[PDB]
Amino acid sequence: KVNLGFKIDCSQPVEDKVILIGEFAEFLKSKIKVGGKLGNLGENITISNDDKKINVQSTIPFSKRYLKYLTKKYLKKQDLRNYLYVTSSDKNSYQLRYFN
Amino acid sequence: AQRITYRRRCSYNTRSNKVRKVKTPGGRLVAQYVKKVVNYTKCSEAGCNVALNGIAQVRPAEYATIARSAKTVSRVYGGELCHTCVRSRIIRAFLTEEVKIVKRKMIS
Amino acid sequence: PKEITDIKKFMKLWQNKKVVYVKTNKRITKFKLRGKKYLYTFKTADPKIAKGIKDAIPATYSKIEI
Amino acid sequence: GANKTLNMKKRFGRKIKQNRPLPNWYRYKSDTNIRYNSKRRNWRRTKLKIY
């Protein structure tokens, strides 16, 4: 058992009304898998929303790798991927960006 | 899969031409030329053929580079003979002279 | 390249054109003497030995830091 | 190949120099019939003797 947490910095897109923190949140809750479950968000895992960021905390072992995966899928669903790219801002955080 | 190149202009595989694959800090896999193994040092007496202890097994050159220790041992024939052969030598010499004197007194 | 465990021999070597190269790593620090046929490294863990050796830098030897 | 005698090197050098074309200004001399260097040689079509 460990305390892990990860910060997804969604700052840029909110400002232009591209991302909606609200829906990204729901998305993440949906696609997060425990032991093969889409829904058991069982208490060990926690998700928070802010205006600019999302936070994931877990007792159960986790890797931001997964976060990047999910995020990407989200971006492809929203067709934003030719605009946005996720990157590693810090050890514990992944930031979104526009290119050009 | 990385492949190598001889570095010596001798492409033929000869006991003296052996190569070993080394992995460098560069990430390269490089041929490095490996040297030849040599036979351990044996006691010199007839039919004995014992592996000497406490002497280094070294390629002939490096023998000029080592410390006196590896070149030697502390017995009467330190380098040349093993203990058993030393011992049997001692004994034989002593007893032989004894028989010699005995023959001498029996002659006089 | 030789490395030294006991500060004494190291200090005999830097007491013996002499310059001393100190370099920082996260967990450790290293002190480095240049001599004709050998490059002497000296590593320490704790800051005490560290500062103590930084003190030890004589007027004869100039200290370079990377 | 790689390995060569001196003799070789020198000979090769020689033939290498001798293989230049007639210098364009020699054709302007008053007493010459020489349009070109008749003795030029091409490694592929003709081989030297070195052994």
Place this chain on the structure above:
RNA sequence: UAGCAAAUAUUCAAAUGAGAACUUUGAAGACCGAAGUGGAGAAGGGUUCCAUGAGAACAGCAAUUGUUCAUGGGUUACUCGA
């Protein structure tokens, strides 16, 4: 005229040029498939290597391209080998 038919294969756009099926970039489709169409040597070759330039000839069609022509430049060792 015989003939230029072995070794699976090429295609699209741009650029360069008097001229492009045969040159250069990119985009596609296939091959050798680590017993190679890969990376390096010995023998043999001797400058064929590198760069820039290019009329004819040669590269059995072609060429703006070259193993060809012209000009310049390249081969450093106590530890490799002799």
Place this chain on the structure above:
RNA sequence: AGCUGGACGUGGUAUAGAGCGGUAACGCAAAGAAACCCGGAGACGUCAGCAGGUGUCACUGGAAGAGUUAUCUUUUCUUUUUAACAUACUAUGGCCAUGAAAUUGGAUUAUCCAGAGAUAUCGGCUGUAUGUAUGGCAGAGCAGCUCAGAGCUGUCAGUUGCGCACCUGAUGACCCUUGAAAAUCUGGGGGAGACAUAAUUUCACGCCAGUUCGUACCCAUAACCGCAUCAGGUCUCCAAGGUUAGCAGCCUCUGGUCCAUAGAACAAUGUAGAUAAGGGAAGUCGGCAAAUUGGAUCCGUAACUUCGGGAUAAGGAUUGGCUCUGAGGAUCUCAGAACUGAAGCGGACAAAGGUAAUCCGA
């Protein structure tokens, strides 16, 4: 970083003759020497299996990047490196003690060893790394991200293999075969000489030098030889994934390549490739050519014989997919059962057609 040859400097070993420790194997920066005589290494075959290491390949958690995202995919790929050299430790064997073994033991996959001293001791000594740790070393290399040449981040921690190539270690088998030499480095036995302000000494650290020649490039379906840019010929090393007995074939990644004048038509004849209802060599000098056969597992297997063989003799079956069950091991093989298909399943690739006689030559 190492090596050889120089030449002294500063420290240190040793001796009024010439280190010290251990019972012993043996040990330790150093511890006097000529003729002379003996050594060790150099210094070696073929094959078979075993063990280990390197490189490679595979897998696991972490991190950065990239591919896919209508659907599914905590996903798929990529990087995640460590030179010679220094010090210390471990390494398939051999030795030294102590004690001797019969209700003989020990031990390998195999051999094989022992009172000519086995086994066994909180025993000990020694030899070999392409091993481990640290130095080298991160400052380099690699992967990402910024800034307008400078900058920042990470390069981490594990597991397994009758896998593969090479090397090493300990063995085994073989010969009416028994598998170079010298230069070179080094050790032993011997103690003639040399020497008091002395003499000599395989310790450290420092000072000096390393000359001459070859180093480009091709090594081939275009740099060689074949009158050539010839479908021939020409000695080597490095080797990835999948299938598999497999370095076969077939398909892939790294790296390379599309070069072989082109376009269109589609007759005869041809070169190469296939398939033919019914019959089955009637064709033909002739079964020439083609066809059949082909893996693996289970059955079954004659005469003849020099008893080795014949032998995949001949012949008869099975082979996919899927869902379960049991057995062999450490601190990947084998067997059962059930269900399901156009009764197909070595689905490509790979891959014997048999039998009975006669003649030669063993």
